[PDB]
Amino acid sequence: EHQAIAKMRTMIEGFDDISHGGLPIGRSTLVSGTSGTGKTLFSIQFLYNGIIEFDEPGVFVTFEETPQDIIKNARSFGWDLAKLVDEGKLFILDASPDPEGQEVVGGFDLSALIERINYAIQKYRARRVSIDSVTSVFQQYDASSVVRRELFRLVARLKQIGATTVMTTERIEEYGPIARYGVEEFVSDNVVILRNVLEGERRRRTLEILKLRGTSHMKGEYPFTITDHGINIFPLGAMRLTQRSSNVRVSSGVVRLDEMCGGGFFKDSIILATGATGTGKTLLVSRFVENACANKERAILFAYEESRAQLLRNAYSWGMDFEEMERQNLLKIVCAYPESAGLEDHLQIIKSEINDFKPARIAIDSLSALARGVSNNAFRQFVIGVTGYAKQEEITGLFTNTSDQFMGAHSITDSHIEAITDTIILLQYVEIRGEMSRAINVFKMRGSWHDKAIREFMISDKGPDIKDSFRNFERIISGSPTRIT
Amino acid sequence: EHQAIAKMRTMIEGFDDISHGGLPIGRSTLVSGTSGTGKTLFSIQFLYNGIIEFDEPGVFVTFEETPQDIIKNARSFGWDLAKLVDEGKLFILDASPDPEGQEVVGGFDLSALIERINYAIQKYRARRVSIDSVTSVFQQYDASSVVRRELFRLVARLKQIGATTVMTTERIEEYGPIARYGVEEFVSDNVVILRNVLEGERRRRTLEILKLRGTSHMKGEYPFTITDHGINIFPLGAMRLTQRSSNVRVSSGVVRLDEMCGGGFFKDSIILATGATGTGKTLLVSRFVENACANKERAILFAYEESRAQLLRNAYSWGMDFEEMERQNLLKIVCAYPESAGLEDHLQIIKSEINDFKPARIAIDSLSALARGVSNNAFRQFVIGVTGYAKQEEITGLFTNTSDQFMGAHSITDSHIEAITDTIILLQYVEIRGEMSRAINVFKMRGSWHDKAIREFMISDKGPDIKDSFRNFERIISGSPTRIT
Amino acid sequence: EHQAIAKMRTMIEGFDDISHGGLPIGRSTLVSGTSGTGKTLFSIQFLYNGIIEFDEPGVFVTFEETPQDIIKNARSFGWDLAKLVDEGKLFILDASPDPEGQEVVGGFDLSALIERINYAIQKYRARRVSIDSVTSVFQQYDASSVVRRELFRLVARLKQIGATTVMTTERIEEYGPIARYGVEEFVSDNVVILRNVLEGERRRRTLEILKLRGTSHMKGEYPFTITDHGINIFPLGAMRLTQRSSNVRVSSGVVRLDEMCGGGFFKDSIILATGATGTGKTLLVSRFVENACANKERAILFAYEESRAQLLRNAYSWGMDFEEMERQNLLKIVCAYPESAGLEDHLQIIKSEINDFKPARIAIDSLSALARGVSNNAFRQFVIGVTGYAKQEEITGLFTNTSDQFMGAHSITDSHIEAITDTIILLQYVEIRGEMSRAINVFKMRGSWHDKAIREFMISDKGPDIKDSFRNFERIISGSPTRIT
Ligand SMILES: Nc1ncnc2c1ncn2[C@@H]1O[C@H](COP(=O)(O)OP(=O)(O)OP(=O)(O)O)[C@@H](O)[C@H]1O
Ligand SMILES: Nc1ncnc2c1ncn2[C@@H]1O[C@H](COP(=O)(O)OP(=O)(O)OP(=O)(O)O)[C@@H](O)[C@H]1O
Ligand SMILES: Nc1ncnc2c1ncn2[C@@H]1O[C@H](COP(=O)(O)OP(=O)(O)OP(=O)(O)O)[C@@H](O)[C@H]1O
Ligand SMILES: Nc1ncnc2c1ncn2[C@@H]1O[C@H](COP(=O)(O)OP(=O)(O)OP(=O)(O)O)[C@@H](O)[C@H]1O
Ligand SMILES: Nc1ncnc2c1ncn2[C@@H]1O[C@H](COP(=O)(O)OP(=O)(O)OP(=O)(O)O)[C@@H](O)[C@H]1O
Ligand SMILES: Nc1ncnc2c1ncn2[C@@H]1O[C@H](COP(=O)(O)OP(=O)(O)OP(=O)(O)O)[C@@H](O)[C@H]1O
Ligand SMILES: [Mg+2]
Ligand SMILES: [Mg+2]
Ligand SMILES: [Mg+2]
Ligand SMILES: [Mg+2]
Ligand SMILES: [Mg+2]
Ligand SMILES: [Mg+2]
């Protein structure tokens, strides 16, 4: 009846979603990767979480490191492994080579290693075991035939013991063999690969589960970051299209625009404002976050094109006061360049700021800034992540997207994200009698009636002023209309 | 007279179509692939199906696994191999190395292995044999010259016995050599390759038959998935252009549109609705599935851009009630992100939901959502698969495709799938006197008369309201017409 | 005086054209390729044809196969090698290793092999010899220096005997070395390579002659297929631009169109009908094949976009009766998806159906369907092949090509095949007073006067109805004209 294999949760954020419940119990898992991919962190975090979350003792077998550096490095992540050792929950088995040039055999006594591991497991009643570097042994006997045999023996004995084991191995190439010998991936039952791929001049960390014998999992690579709390994976494919909806309305900060939108924006919606540079997109954003503050709601403004000081100045020139909204702890401004962090990191930053500040609304100053140097697929996934999260958390979201052209536009955005957006506002230039006028239109609104008029508007020190449609002109959308009466 | 070689059906969905009847009888088949490609599953599923479908006993020769893990892993697929062993239909021959560092010869007694296999075959009257890993032997003698000889001996003896054998081997590279030594593909009579190709950040499983001596087969790769029921292959090239047709009509849910279509849509047809975001494509979809329910017919709505909760809200705003249609078990809504599954998996999901719910109609909320991150060829094949299936099963199908531009469109779709579609509905924006109006046109309808008018329409809380053509304007299709009277 | 070297015809369709008369007499030919490329079939088909066509006895030297499997596999192609052995015309020399682990020398007695071959040649008065796998010997002594020497000895002795020999060798990579050792291509006088290249997810079989010492040949790769009758090569470059012409006219099935074409279409011509989907291209095709049947001529309709059942329905809606035309054995309908076969196979299928049915006319339902997933060069070659063949066989050919856009077209086709077509018919949409009207124009006709008018036409249940030109409008070709009076 499709009986599942029982699994042990790793509690590594996002991992248990990818693996569909964690790692199979009583089996080994092989974690491979190039230097700097976070293999050691994965195997430490595995034992650490087991001990504190489930009260499951464990053993860390060390070959390259020493117990002192394992503990010292761990401290950077907020956890204390020395404490767990003193309490008899964590045990580190030191199998290092020692800083000596002496040798006796030239090989390695695998049998002795296994018996020492078995002893440690029984003594501490370990449920979880990690091995620092299996291949640190095989270097003394590097034929693929002997590697297969010796690895088989280690894996088989661990199964007999019953402890769940995470073995660490190593690779040279990001897209080369799973492990050095082309053997380990055929012997082990469960294979996980950590990568740190260099593309252009940036690095992207990704995790993949190649296989889990006897059980299902998500396939392909999923991005992750290493932060102060350890490994945090972001399996976008695990996000479901099950977000809630409502008929609750919120003001845009602009009264006439609220009328055009049929009584304000929906609270539970994504709003995209597009247009050429200088059309006033950031004016609507500033008024949006102000309205939240006016009603004593928290809001976060994520700035990418302008510094905080410049935002304050421009806001004052429009009759707004950002410093006052900050003093009341209603408005928070987060300024960074798109280039200061990876796209994966920007997503994490947005989520972290939301979790700490608990906003009713957020705004993204420029999606086109975030798209710089980003492929269409990578960018789109970011947008889906941010908008999906905002919907999930019931946060009203206003997003800005700059057009690459100011006349003759055939489209509203070139990012192809208008299928994600619920409400679209267009700001465009219109050339009337030798002058560069502006116009505003509500292009669509999924849950409501909206105005159809393309209305002229002006920007003053009181903010936007929306007037009448261009009734006596043709070809307004093109930006270069002709007068007919 | 072109005498065919008799074949043994594998009963692996789609495999017997690719192989033109299964595997040649009394011959070996070599199945190669990288770790995690499902080689073991293929060879187990082969023996399993033979035993339950044709009552043909078989032998599984094990080198890396143990009988206990073979059985335990198998259980995840719903079948019980332990039961078949107890009944004397399935036999597992344990040729594992044992978890010991001891050795006697350093090579392998192939003669002893063959005699043990022969014994098992005669004892259980086996017709089918599988070998877990032939190359687990060759590792002890890795010269290409000895591998060729020893493999030849194994294959030749199996032919003399008469049992049909599926041998498993291994590869390192997806597009490299068929097998490790560059030998096995020249010795074996029948060669099958399983791949798990990483492209971008996604994996695609494919199956290929490289050759079958003395018999024809389909060529190239064919996609497959591994599901709860084992391997399921989707050989699109095996689908025939032989679908039925009729003059039966069904209502669109919109009375005026039914008139434009000459008396409703054809039941046995594919309908494509295209247009820019905000033109009301999802309004027609909602009314389409409602009409089915109104007549007490089942329908499935496959949602990609909107969650269930949002669909319910938007439907209520248009005077519809989706929850009631669900309570009557007439309407089913399936919501998922395009990124949550592979394109191959989306096709399988659609087919599975149809098989379980038995709909009269289906609708695809957004083909352009499914096309995200998908090459033109991969996408087109998906569309052919879904539409071909819907025609085959006599299911009325409504598909939505968003335009990337809202003005100056030269085409109806950029996916080049309009040659598949039988009926095409276009929704466009028309700029009239400074406002963004909408228009609807039936572009084509293969089996019927249709209206030619491009008609203005409005969307209210009663749904679409289709009016008159723009008789006094020119250049309506461009979206920015000029008035002439 | 440019004395040629006498050649021996292989009678392998297309091969003797590429080789300019077959293989040089009294010399060896090396056939290399990867597993599954049809090397064995080539060498068997060579001996087989020699025996039945020229009554030339031959010897097949076997290393990997056994006589029983050679015969059994051969039967699938309709020929019986056992019969030829019994009659003393075909001899199979068994040089297999036997299914034994025993060895005496560890090398190979080449001298003994040669003497056995010589004996067989004299005994059966062989003129043709094939060798199953030369490299099955060299595996026991794999240095490039010994391979060169031993191969030289074999080739030199065969020349002294005088028999023409086709040797088989093997490769790992499709575009790598000609043979495993980088030797055989320098020793042998005549080198032929068989490939099975994987591009995207499809395989293409091609044949190339790398060199023939002392004689000319066609260069580069030429596509081939393996069918029930063995290897069939399609050397498009061997086709000559020497097709016949005449002033014979045939009706289009539409009376008014016949007038526009100056008295009907030329019998010996290629007619291309282009336009956007829904312009009635398939209406003209249906009437075209009907006219043939009306005059009691056979015609084949090759369908790619529509099933037979749908074609019948749509034809009935236009006042036609396809089933009746089938009963009289005048109309034949061949339905398949473009994806069901390779482009090379589609060409072969068209030729085979023509040879069996002996049509006066053929029609291709959609060239744009066949172009799916096909590069511009591969597609164009297909079109040249089909149209060249149709002209050669004096078959009137009507081809359909769908436009990717319906407004603002600058061109008639994007396939760049209008230079092949003799007569071009354009169907376009014209937007008149808010409606989507249609228009028909004869764009060109190489051998005749044709009308210049762009005429409005309607489609009813009586088929097309062609009226008057748009005399009072400008910019008709653009599809969005303006009225001037
Ligand atoms: N507190 C922290 N905050 C952010 N990043 C950190 C922190 N601590 C460590 N890192 C990063 O995480 C990475 C973890 O490296 P790790 O030791 O897991 O690599 P490894 O694969 O074990 O190395 P090797 O392959 O040489 O054994 C480090 O390269 C470091 O840059
Ligand atoms: N005090 C003011 N009075 C009148 N007009 C102003 C004032 N402040 C700004 N503007 C106008 O607003 C425009 C800038 O708009 P805003 O900064 O809101 O968005 P944007 O800069 O167009 O967006 P992007 O950052 O993509 O360019 C300027 O071109 C300027 O003419
Ligand atoms: N119940 C299930 N549902 C979905 N997927 C499954 C299920 N059970 C197994 N799988 C997947 O199918 C794959 C089958 O792997 P399999 O053991 O066939 O690989 P293999 O080629 O035999 O491995 P190796 O090359 O190491 O011998 C697994 O990697 C697993 O992810
Ligand atoms: N209750 C309503 N009254 C008036 N107009 C409405 C109402 N509900 C929705 N609309 C209009 O319908 C439009 C959305 O149409 P719909 O959601 O059916 O397809 P779509 O969203 O254009 O397709 P896509 O998802 O590709 O954008 C909105 O722009 C809005 O103006
Ligand atoms: N009756 C048939 N109809 C269609 N195709 C066939 C038929 N018989 C054989 N074939 C195909 O033709 C191919 C001929 O393979 P062939 O034995 O020539 O390969 P090979 O190069 O000799 O193999 P190897 O390199 O392993 O010696 C087969 O792979 C098979 O798929
Ligand atoms: N009985 C009929 N009465 C009136 N018009 C019809 C009838 N049958 C079909 N039509 C019209 O013919 C059009 C389809 O034309 P046809 O199928 O001949 O070529 P096509 O479908 O445009 O070519 P493609 O397959 O490339 O789209 C439809 O759009 C429809 O309006
Ligand atoms: Mg480490
Ligand atoms: Mg700005
Ligand atoms: Mg396996
Ligand atoms: Mg929609
Ligand atoms: Mg062969
Ligand atoms: Mg057609």
Curated annotation (Swiss-Prot), chains A, B, C:
Keywords: ATP-binding, Biological rhythms, Hydrolase, Kinase, Magnesium, Metal-binding, Nucleotide-binding, Phosphoprotein, Repeat, Serine/threonine-protein kinase, Transcription, Transcription regulation, Transferase. Interaction with KaiA stimulates autophosphorylation, KaiC interaction with KaiB sequesters KaiA, preventing it stimulating the KaiC kinase, leading to autodephosphorylation. A KaiA dimer is sufficient to enhance KaiC phosphorylation. Interaction of KaiA with the A-loop stimulates autokinase activity. The active site is at E64, E305. Disruption phenotype: Not essential for growth on low light, loss of circadian cycle and rhythmicity. Loss of rhythmic chromosome compaction. No visible phenotype during growth in a light/dark regime for 5-7 days (at 150 umol photons/m(2)/s). Accumulates much larger amounts of primary metabolites (especially those in and connected to the oxidative pentose phosphate pathway) in 4 hours after dark-light transition. Glycogen accumulates 4-5 hours earlier than normal, overall levels are higher, no change in glycogen degradation kinetics. Changing R308Q: In kaiC9; shortens the period of the circadian rhythm to 21 hours. Changing Q381K: Very slow phosphorylation in presence of KaiA, none in presence of KaiA-KaiB. The modification Phosphothreonine is found at A419. Mg(2+) 1 binds at T40. Phosphorylated and dephosphorylated on serine/threonine residues by autocatalysis. Unphosphorylated, mono- and di-phosphorylated forms exist. The phosphorylated form correlates with clock speed. The presence of KaiA increases phosphorylation and stabilizes these forms. Phosphorylated on serine and threonine residues by autocatalysis. Signal peptide: none annotated. ATP 1 binds at G36, T37, G38, K39, T40, L41, S76, K211, L212, R213, T215, H217, T227, D228. Residues 102-109 are annotated as: B-loop, required to bind KaiB and SasA. Changing T29S: Extends the period of the circadian rhythm to 28 hours in reconstituted KaiABC complex. Decreased endogenous ATPase. The modification Phosphoserine is found at E418. Residues 475-484 are annotated as: A-loop, interacts with KaiA. Mg(2+) 2 binds at T282, E305. NCBIfam families: circ_KaiC, PRK09302.1. This is Circadian clock oscillator protein KaiC. It comes from Synechococcus elongatus (strain ATCC 33912 / PCC 7942 / FACHB-805) (Anacystis nidulans R2).
